[PDB]
């Protein structure tokens, strides 16, 4: 055999401390519950909060952070022992239970640039964007061979010597028996582990301006291989180590470094929100007690900082809630995504509304008229340059799939790009193809666009068709088109100015002392935890300088986010009464005689107008948590479309 | 562990004593008859159905699904052992490899010395003398997996996936057993190839040369060797099964033997096979370990869900005179109205008869261009036709442009050569190419489409490519607006240019709104007198029509000429018509006759063709 340790004092102490920490039963069983949850979910990787670990035993936390491999092995042994104690069969099912880390890393939290050799063999939490990924390959961790000549069955094991001294003996795949009998490998019986290599680059918006970006190579293994794709703003918690070179004889002293990832995370904004019992109870209470005016309350509480534009705010809320897709048995599809175009006079806060949607709605992609040009906007087809094979790169729409694309300077956008996105706006999919590849990417995103009317400022004395240079083909697929006019009414100016000045004079309680400048400079960002991958919530915003007073509260941002997320899943069904009402209203709307004279249509009326009527009714039902599209929902939809589709020509 | 001799006996027992009533209710030895056939060398591929196996031995099915390669070899060896006792006569030596096998067996018998024990390596390899191949058919209880989810945890298992075929190499000979002949003794040497590469042998290990201690340099040659039809394809996930924001994932499928030439790029396929690795030596492995590629070895390829490769009920349905209208109304039942448009689309899906009179082809394809205002369901119609037709390519404005429509050149991997890969038109070579936003399509793309319409080919004379492609597809363009935009370029080419103007109207708009709202209520069109045909039935009927070439009797010659002359006079008097319009008449009438499933076109078909043509023409006004 060989050397076998008997009394490793450090290993015994580490195992004891980690098992004590994982007991947690007296410590409100946080990690007991986590272990039980992973057992039920059939997972074999425990994510541990380093902050809790440090609180329990700062010594163990420091030892783990500064000595990665040894302490991680001890932690995994303790986790396997705990899993066996809770349930032995599962522990025997899974050979090794891995431990990934999470929380606030004081100094270990770095970027690919600040990640220097001082962090070798330490636990580092590096932020960045995945520049490239590799195919998921299986590495044999235990091979099984059968010898026909002797009917024997052997099993060879290969250890994970990724960042350890490896010799030819350990990495030789048997191909003969001791008597030179050919073997045959039993692939089914053999054990493989999935392995992938990615590249994390410093975020361009974080990198020093004008310099080339700093990268790092990351190794992912079983249960972490496909946690990211190129262009993902990922946080990788791992162990930084030097990769061994090939058996040489002369060494230059240069060692490639790599990050053995122990955990991968995406932007927490798109993550599944945590709904506690009290939170769901509050949502139930809100929906039940207030249903008649809940949609109006949410619409008015949507963007507190932007005054007026009540109809536009309601339309934006409908866009956020979305409709419901129709998946017909014969494959025909109907989008449930509302498209909104805000056009009007300069300085009407349309860009502010788009920015608010970007900040709030999950999977919201900003874009500018000329910022994205075709292949950048939709998907693109390139070549690997190393394999000679075609490859697909997701554009803004694809990345915004099941989300929102907030486009600004839509008018400035070239006609080619608008023609290209025509398909996305209605079918919600991108159809690209080159000679060696063809795909139909899913882009189920709602387009919220902003534009400036021709002549810079809206012309009250010209038809909306002439004011808007967008042709009918592109106008139709916009479900709602709102003309936001900078009317010069003295009273509206009074209200707007009062709101703006109040918002400017507001200061955040506690953090601001009356003279602080909150800007930081490229260091505090890494010093403190990133508020982009981080881990009690009220319902109505407490009175503050934002508003003076009234008998109508304003919904909290977090509560509104949770409520919208819950309500978006609802798929209210269209009732016969609402269906008949919508059909008759669509007939009347299409019949031009209904609308008065001196009134010009913003956009043409079409079957798509009917479809957006249905979608708006569905969105109102979702807001109400109704589960059925009712007469009030149909009324609100018809009201909104009637307001949006007609504008009075002044003279 | 398991005793593979016992497993071989189990598979022998199953293969011998499994019976089914498939043959017209009569009990039959499903696999016994196949064994007889391939012992006579009348069949090559033996597809063992794991549902059949599980009918009496579920544990064997589980073991196969866990170690499919091992049991694949067990089944192949059992078949080979059983063949001699099922042979009932002498084969006719249909193949040179059969000649080689006959000679090898005869000479082994001649130098048998039955009692003597020959060394384990002094024997013909199993693969060298098979002339057959055993594949599986995955058990129906195994839910198909997603290419993304097929990972290292299921290597060596038997799994079935479904997806779109993107890239498919050609069929080329892959060495399976390299045969060498010595220059001193006169024996043969056999190297069974398993790795992607092999190092040819130099010295002959035959007994005679070993005794002589002579040179014994042996010569690799293809005559006595054992090749197998080989292909390598890329299979792509389906759009509906891809995650929210990701792109579809690809898998490599290695097809061998009789599974070749089944799938072609653009096909929707389901492939069942074993998830196996390829050793990845040769590179400067950055990370230590035995890393390997991944691939699916094709055991069962089945085109499905768009291009799947009769009954008294369907015969009666065809015999019904309103079968034409039934199919038309079944085309996109959700879309309200557009009855004549849907009838034209059905005529497109059917197509006319191809003509080859004295060295020039008058193609029978039907070209239709849907001009219309926004929101008249042109895109929906084109998408539905794409889903319905067997070989359908739906190309939007510019995402698939240039080489997205025409072929390009890409480096290969099996040969490292420059292979010509087809574009959308070639992928729809003999089907339907639904072009959307044809007006906004690029100029080069529009010229390519014009050329394919006029010739069914695509000539290219660029730098890296110089070829004359073949794309015998029918163009279904959907442009938007001489009204306001009615190019003579489109008029002169499209056999049916339809204008779809939606003037507001209380009654029609209300009916359409009720249709739409019921559709959104029940995920289906409102119930009608006639239930629309399922896509499978529509495809079956259309395919049966396609092979029903009706001819034009000389009696209708004067009738057609009179109609054409009358249309010419009307067009001349009014404020476009030509031989292209006459050929449109001819092929539309032929397609209507084909739909009726007769051999001779009739005045009713001619009248319907003229009626559709006049509806299209006066849609302009």
């Amino acid at each position: 055999a060989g050397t076998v340790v008997l009394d490793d004092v450090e290993l015994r102490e580490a195992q004891r401390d980690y098992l004590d920490f994982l007991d947690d039963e007296e410590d409100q069983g946080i990690y007991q519950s986590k272990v039980r949850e992973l057992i039920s979910d059939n997972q074999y990787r425990l994510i541990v909060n380093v902050n809790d670990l440090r609180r329990k035993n700062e010594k163990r936390a420091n030892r783990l952070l500064n000595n990665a491999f040894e302490e991680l092995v001890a932690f995994q042994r303790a986790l396997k022992d705990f899993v066996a104690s809770i349930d032995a069969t599962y522990a025997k099912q899974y050979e090794e239970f891995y431990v990934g880390l999470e929380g606030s890393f004081g100094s270990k939290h770095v970027s690919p640039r600040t990640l220097t050799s001082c962090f070798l063999s330490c636990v580092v939490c590096v932020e960045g964007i995945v520049t490239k990924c590799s195919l998921v390959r299986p590495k044999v961790v235990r091979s099984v061979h059968y010898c026909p000549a002797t009917k024997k069955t052997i099993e060879r094991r290969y250890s994970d010597l990724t960042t350890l001294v490896a010799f030819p003996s350990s990495s030789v795949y048997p191909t003969k028996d001791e008597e030179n009998n050919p073997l045959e490998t039993e692939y089914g019986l053999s054990v493989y582990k999935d392995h992938q290599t990615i590249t994390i680059q410093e975020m361009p918006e974080k990198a020093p301006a004008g310099q080339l970006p700093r990268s790092v190579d990351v190794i992912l293994d079983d249960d972490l291989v496909d946690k990211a794709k190129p262009g993902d703003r990922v946080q990788v918690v791992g162990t930084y180590r030097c990769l061994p070179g090939k058996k040489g004889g002369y060494t230059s002293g240069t060692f490639r470094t790599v990050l053995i990832a122990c955990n991968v995370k995406q932007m927490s904004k798109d993550a599944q929100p945590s709904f506690s019992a009290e939170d769901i109870a509050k949502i139930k209470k809100f929906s039940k007690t207030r249903s008649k005016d809940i949609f109006d309350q949410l619409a008015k509480s949507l963007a507190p900082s932007i005054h007026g534009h009540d109809y536009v705010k309601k339309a934006i809320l409908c866009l956020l809630l979305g409709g419901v897709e129709r998946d017909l048995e014969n494959g025909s599809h109907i989008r449930g995504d509302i498209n909104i175009l805000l056009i009007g006079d300069p300085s009407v806060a349309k860009s502010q509304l788009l920015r608010y949607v970007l900040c709030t709605a999950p999977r919201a992609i900003p874009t500018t008229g000329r910022g994205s040009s075709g292949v950048g906007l939709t998907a693109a087809v390139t070549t690997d340059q190393e394999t000679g094979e075609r490859r697909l790169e997701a554009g803004a729409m694809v990345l915004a799939d099941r989300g929102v694309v907030c486009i600004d300077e839509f008018d400035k956008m070239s006609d080619m790009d608008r023609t290209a996105i025509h398909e996305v706006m209605e079918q919600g999919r991108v159809t690209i193809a080159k000679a060696g590849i063809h795909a139909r990417l899913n882009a189920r995103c709602s387009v919220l666009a902003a534009a400036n009317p021709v002549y810079g400022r809206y012309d009250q004395y010209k038809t909306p068709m002439e004011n808007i240079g967008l042709q009918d083909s592109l106008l139709s697929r916009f479900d709602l088109l709102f003309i936001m006019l900078d009317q010069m009414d003295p009273e509206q100016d009074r209200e707007i100015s009062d709101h703006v000045l109040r918002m400017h004079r507001y200061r955040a309680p506690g953090e601001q002392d009356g003279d602080a400048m909150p800007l930081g400079s490229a260091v505090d960002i890494l010093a403190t935890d990133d508020p982009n991958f981080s881990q009690i919530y009220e319902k109505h915003d407490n009175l503050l300088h934002g508003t003076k007073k009234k008998k109508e509260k304003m919904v909290s941002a977090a509560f509104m986010k949770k409520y919208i997320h819950v309500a978006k899943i609802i798929k209210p069904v269209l009732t016969q009464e609402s269906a008949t009402y919508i059909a008759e209203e669509y007939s009347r709307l299409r019949s031009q005689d209904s609308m008065s004279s001196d009134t010009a249509r913003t956009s043409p009326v079409t079957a798509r107008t009917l479809e957006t009527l249905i979608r708006l009714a569905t969105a109102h039902a979702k807001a109400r948590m109704s589960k059925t599209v009712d007469l009030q929902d149909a009324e609100e939809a018809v009201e909104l479309v009637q307001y949006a589709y007609f504008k009075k020509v002044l003279e | 562990l398991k005793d593979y001799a016992l497993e071989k006996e189990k598979v022998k027992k199953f293969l011998q004593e499994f019976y089914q009533d498939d043959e017209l209710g009569k009990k039959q030895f499903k696999y016994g008859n196949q064994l007889v056939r391939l012992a006579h060398r009348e069949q090559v591929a033996l597809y063992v159905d794991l549902d059949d196996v599980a009918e009496d031995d579920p544990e064997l099915v589980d073991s196969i699904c866990e170690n499919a390669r091992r049991y694949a070899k067990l089944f192949a060896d059992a078949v080979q052992e059983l063949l001699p006792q099922y042979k009932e006569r002498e084969v006719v030596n249909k193949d040179v490899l059969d000649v080689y096998i006959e000679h090898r067996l005869m000479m082994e018998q001649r130098s048998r010395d039955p009692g003597m024990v020959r060394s384990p390596q002094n024997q013909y390899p199993a693969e060298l003398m098979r002339r057959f191949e055993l594949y599986f058919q995955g058990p129906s209880s195994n839910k198909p997996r997603v290419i993304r989810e097929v990972r290292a945890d299921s290597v060596g298992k038997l799994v079935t996936v479904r997806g779109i075929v993107t890239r498919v190499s050609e069929v080329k000979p892959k060495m399976v057993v390299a045969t060498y002949t010595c220059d001193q003794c006169g024996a043969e040497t056999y190297q069974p190839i398993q790795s992607p590469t092999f190092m040819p042998l130099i010295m002959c290990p035959s007994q005679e040369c070993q005794t002589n201690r002579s040179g014994g340099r042996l010569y690799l040659q293809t005559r006595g060797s054992r090749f197998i039809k080989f292909q390598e394809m890329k299979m792509q996930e389906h759009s509906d099964q891809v995650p929210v924001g990701n792109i579809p994932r690809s898998i490599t499928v290695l097809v061998e033997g009789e599974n070749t030439r089944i799938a072609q790029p653009g096909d929707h396929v389901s492939v069942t096979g074993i998830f196996l690795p390829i050793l990845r030596t040769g590179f400067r492995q950055v990370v230590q370990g035995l890393l390997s590629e991944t691939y699916l070895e094709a055991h069962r390829i089945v085109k499905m869900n768009k291009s799947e490769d009769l009954t008294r009920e369907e015969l009666r349905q065809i015999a019904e005179e309103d079968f034409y209208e039934k199919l038309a109304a079944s085309i996109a039942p959700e879309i309200y109205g557009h009855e004549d448009v849907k009838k034209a689309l059905l005529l497109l899906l059917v197509g006319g008869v191809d003509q080859s009179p004295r060295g020039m082809k008058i193609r029978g394809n039907i070209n239709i261009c849907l001009m219309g205002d926004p929101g008249v369901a042109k895109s929906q119609l084109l998408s539905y036709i794409d889903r319905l037709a067997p070989r359908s390519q739906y190309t939007t404005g510019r995402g698939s442009s240039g080489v997205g429509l025409t072929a390009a050149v890409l480096r290969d991997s099996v040969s490292g050569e420059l292979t010509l890969e087809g574009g959308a038109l070639v992928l729809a070579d003999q089907g339907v190419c639904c072009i959307d936003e044809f007006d906004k399509m690029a100029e080069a793309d529009r010229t390519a489409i014009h050329e394919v319409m006029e010739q069914q080919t695509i000539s290219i004379a660029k730098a890296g490519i110089l070829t004359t492609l073949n794309a015998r597809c029918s163009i279904l363009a959907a442009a938007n607006p001489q009204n306001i935009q009615l190019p003579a370029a489109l008029l002169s080419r499209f056999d049916l240019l339809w204008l779809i103007q939606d003037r507001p109207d209380r009654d029609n708009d209300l009916r359409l709104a009720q249709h739409i709202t019921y559709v959104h209520q029940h995920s289906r069109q409102p119930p009608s007198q006639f239930e629309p045909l399922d896509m499978k039935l529509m495809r079956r009927y259309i395919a049966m029509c396609r092979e029903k070439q009706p001819m034009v009797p000389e009696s209708l010659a004067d009738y057609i000429t009179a109609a054409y002359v009358e249309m010419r006079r009307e067009a001349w008097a009014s404020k476009y018509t030509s031989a292209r319009t006459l050929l449109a008449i001819l092929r539309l009438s032929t397609a209507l006759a084909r739909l009726r499933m007769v051999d001779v076109v009739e005045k009713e078909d001619v009248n319907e063709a003229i009626r559709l043509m006049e509806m299209s023409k006066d849609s302009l006004l």
């Binding site: 220097t116 050799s117 070798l120 001294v165 010799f167 003996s169 700093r214 990268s215 030097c242 040489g248 004889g249 002369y250 060494t251 230059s252 002293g253 240069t254 060692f255 490639r256 470094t257 | -």
Partner: protein, 49 residues
């Protein structure tokens, strides 16, 4: 020791170089810890015994 003025036109990424290496014997698994590495772009030949 020279002193030179100039303008930088490139700056590679901060790689890792070894000041002290350790080596192990494949057969007897004995170590030769803390072998000093010459500073600068200077290599090192492994022992052959």
């Amino acid at each position: 020791l020279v002193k030179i003025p100039g303008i930088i036109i490139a700056a590679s990424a901060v790689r890792a170089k070894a000041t002290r290496i350790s080596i192990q014997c494949r057969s007897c698994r004995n170590t030769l810890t803390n072998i000093a590495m010459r500073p600068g772009l200077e290599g090192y030949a492994l022992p052959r015994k």
